Amino acid sequence: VLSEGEWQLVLHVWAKVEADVAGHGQDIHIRLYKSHPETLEKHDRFKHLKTEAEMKASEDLKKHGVTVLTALGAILKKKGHHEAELKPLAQSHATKHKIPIKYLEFISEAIIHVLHSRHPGDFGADAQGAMNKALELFRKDIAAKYKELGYQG
Ligand code: HEM
Ligand SMILES: [Cu+2]
Ligand SMILES: [Cu+2]
Ligand SMILES: [Cu+2]
Ligand SMILES: [Cu+2]
Ligand SMILES: [Cu+2]
């Protein structure tokens, strides 16, 4: 569970993501699909994209990244009070896209990597720790909402 100070550090580095949502989104997907090629199979409409440059050039992938990180930012900004924001996301990812919690772990790791790559100085151990705890809380709660919908992934 996060202190007030940890939420501040989460929201501090999130403000940096907000200076270029599309770009961070692209780098997170690139890192994710590269580290964990199986996740690219769920992302069905992006299978045609065979190199890093093609990924960067896909407007479709870039718009998708903004939709994702916008949803995630809205959740983070609630500092744990996110049931209303989590429910819709749990609904499509459980019953429509069928995304295992393992895959939410892989994208959390990709987020942390891109934030560390882009902002070492806004992203030391304490800030890393806080974002990790925030993403852990998101994954725990979405896992509980999955089970409520009858999905065990
Ligand atoms: C931080 C974690 C994530 C957030 C906030 C998130 C958010 C979203 C949002 C807001 C949408 C569009 C509306 C919807 O269908 O719900 C979406 C679409 C989708 N998401 Fe996620 N997502 C996350 C992780 C994942 C992971 C790890 C995968 C699979 C590897 C995944 C697969 C999909 C697919 C297949 C779609 C539909 C894409 C399309 O057809 O355009 N998502 N995601
Ligand atoms: Cu950044
Ligand atoms: Cu995605
Ligand atoms: Cu509450
Ligand atoms: Cu490093
Ligand atoms: Cu700063």
Side-chain angles (χ1 to χ4, degrees), residues 20 22-27 113-121:
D20 174 22
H24 285 76
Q26 293 176 122
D27 284 356
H113 179 77
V114 165
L115 286 181
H116 157 63
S117 294
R118 286 195 180 215
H119 311 282

Side-chain angles (χ1 to χ4, degrees), residues 125-139:
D126 287 4
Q128 204 155 176
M131 183 61 60
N132 267 135
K133 287 175 183 160
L135 296 173
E136 162 199 339
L137 180 59
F138 160 77
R139 295 191 304 282

Side-chain angles (χ1 to χ4, degrees), residues 6-53:
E6 286 180 308
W7 284 117
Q8 294 178 199
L9 287 169
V10 169
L11 298 186
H12 183 76
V13 76
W14 205 261
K16 311 232 100 264
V17 170
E18 294 192 341
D20 174 22
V21 178
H24 285 76
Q26 293 176 122
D27 284 356
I28 291 163
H29 282 114
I30 293 162
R31 173 64 180 199
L32 180 59
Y33 297 151
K34 188 235 166 198
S35 291
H36 298 282
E38 72 282 33
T39 57
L40 190 36
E41 302 169 347
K42 249 64 188 64
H43 280 121
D44 198 33
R45 63 202 293 249
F46 305 134
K47 288 175 82 70
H48 320 223
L49 270 15
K50 305 294 224 340
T51 60
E52 167 187 289

Side-chain angles (χ1 to χ4, degrees), residues 29 32-33 36 38-46 60 64 66-73 75 88-93 96-108 111 135 138-139 142 146:
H29 282 114
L32 180 59
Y33 297 151
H36 298 282
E38 72 282 33
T39 57
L40 190 36
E41 302 169 347
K42 249 64 188 64
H43 280 121
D44 198 33
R45 63 202 293 249
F46 305 134
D60 208 271
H64 170 63
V66 173
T67 297
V68 170
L69 260 0
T70 295
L72 180 62
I75 286 159
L89 193 68
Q91 187 94 260
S92 59
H93 287 60
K96 203 275 178 64
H97 320 304
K98 282 286 190 83
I99 308 303
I101 300 289
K102 206 169 138 63
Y103 288 17
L104 278 2
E105 294 178 336
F106 295 161
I107 199 175
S108 296
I111 293 167
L135 296 173
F138 160 77
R139 295 191 304 282
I142 224 195
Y146 277 8

